[PDB]
Amino acid sequence: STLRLLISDSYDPWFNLAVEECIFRQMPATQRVLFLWRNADTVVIGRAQNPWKECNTRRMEEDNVRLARRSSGGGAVFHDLGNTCFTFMAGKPEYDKTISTSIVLNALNALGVSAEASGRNDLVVKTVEGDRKVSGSAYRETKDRGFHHGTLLLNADLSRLANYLNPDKKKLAAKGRVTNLTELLPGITHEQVCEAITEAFFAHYGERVEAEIISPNKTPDLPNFAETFARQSSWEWNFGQAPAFSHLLDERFTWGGVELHFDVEKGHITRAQVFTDSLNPAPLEALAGRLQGCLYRADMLQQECEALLVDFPEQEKELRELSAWMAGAVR
């Protein structure tokens, strides 16, 4: 058909993320994909975060909470089985964010819930006591495709995340809602919401297909899956070793916190590593790239940092701020 419908029968977050990674980059942009899944207890961190600073790893081990690192930026997210998650993908020009958003809204309507879009990302139910968030999401575009994924809060434990994160004093010093569906719909299950999104998906495209039910015990019909799954679940990718440097500079900006670890010998940086919870870590990863071998002196720290501007027009503020902050922090 023109449709693929993938239903994960696994709570393994490395398995579920590896499928998403195949939808986004492995699969041909040539069908319309809906993938429906959830994870057992997991902290998902952005690709540039340092879990040894961010997470109470001892508590995680004691409570049997998993760590997964995703390949986009941003901060920590908590998953459990009371989150029902969805990923849509479709080729351009045909697809844009509005289709999948409408499909999920219809799904929610079919369930007896009056929901609306709110911002570029969220879905919200109108309430006597004001707007309540029932869904988070993120949208990404490629040259060949659009890609949309998010979660629905059916019966999430909302308190839990804070037990697994370390206090961040500078995040605290700086400064700059949500409801479970089970609060409205006491019987609601994962399977019912999956059923509802699938129907709204089939109704939209005028077509039906059989569900491919997928789990780690056999290869899904996704190219390069075995390798993507070996990488996604590897300790070295999800955790990695703690940074071991002799200097550390850190700051919380409005667009994210930044930790910069490095060594200085003979007045130059001999090695450096940057961490961040910024939504776009690319300009920070590329700063780390340009800091190697740099003269440890504000004029050069700023020259290296500002040499990147031409290639990051949308992040010019981020870079101007990092640059000013380093000039101030080094003296």
From Swiss-Prot:
Keyword terms: ATP-binding, Cytoplasm, Ligase, Nucleotide-binding
Outcome of swapping S72A: 20-fold decrease in affinity for ATP
Cellular component terms (Gene Ontology): cytoplasm; cytosol
Other comment: In the transfer reaction, the free carboxyl group of lipoic acid is attached via an amide linkage to the epsilon-amino group of a specific lysine residue of lipoyl domains of lipoate-dependent enzymes.
Gene behind this protein: lplA
MF term (GO), any: ATP binding
BPL/LPL catalytic domain ranges (all copies): 28-209
Superkingdom, natural source: Bacteria
Pathway(s): Protein modification; protein lipoylation via exogenous pathway; protein N(6)-(lipoyl)lysine from lipoate: step 1/2; Protein modification; protein lipoylation via exogenous pathway; protein N(6)-(lipoyl)lysine from lipoate: step 2/2
Main location: cytoplasm
Subunit structure: Monomer.
Residue numbers binding ATP: R70, G75, A76, V77, F78, K133
Organism for this UniProt entry: Escherichia coli (strain K12)
CDD domains in the cross-refs: BPL_LplA_LipB
Enzyme Commission number(s) of this protein: 6.3.1.20
GO BP term, example: protein lipoylation
Subcellular location field: Cytoplasm
Swiss-Prot/TrEMBL catalytic activity: L-lysyl-[lipoyl-carrier protein] + (R)-lipoate + ATP = N(6)-[(R)-lipoyl]-L-lysyl-[lipoyl-carrier protein] + AMP + diphosphate + H(+)
Official protein name in the record: Lipoate-protein ligase A
Family: Belongs to the LplA family.
Effect seen on changing G73S: In lplA1 or slr1; selenolipoate resistance mutation
Record field: pH dependence: Most active from pH 5.5 to 8.0. Inactive below pH 4.3.
Regulation of its activity: 6-seleno-octanoate, 8-thio-octanoate and 8-seleno-octanoate caused 100%, 50% and 63% inhibition respectively. Inhibited by Cu(2+).
Function: Catalyzes both the ATP-dependent activation of exogenously supplied lipoate to lipoyl-AMP and the transfer of the activated lipoyl onto the lipoyl domains of lipoate-dependent enzymes. Is also able to catalyze very poorly the transfer of lipoyl and octanoyl moiety from their acyl carrier protein.
Binding, (R)-lipoate: K133
One Pfam family it belongs to: Lip_prot_lig_C
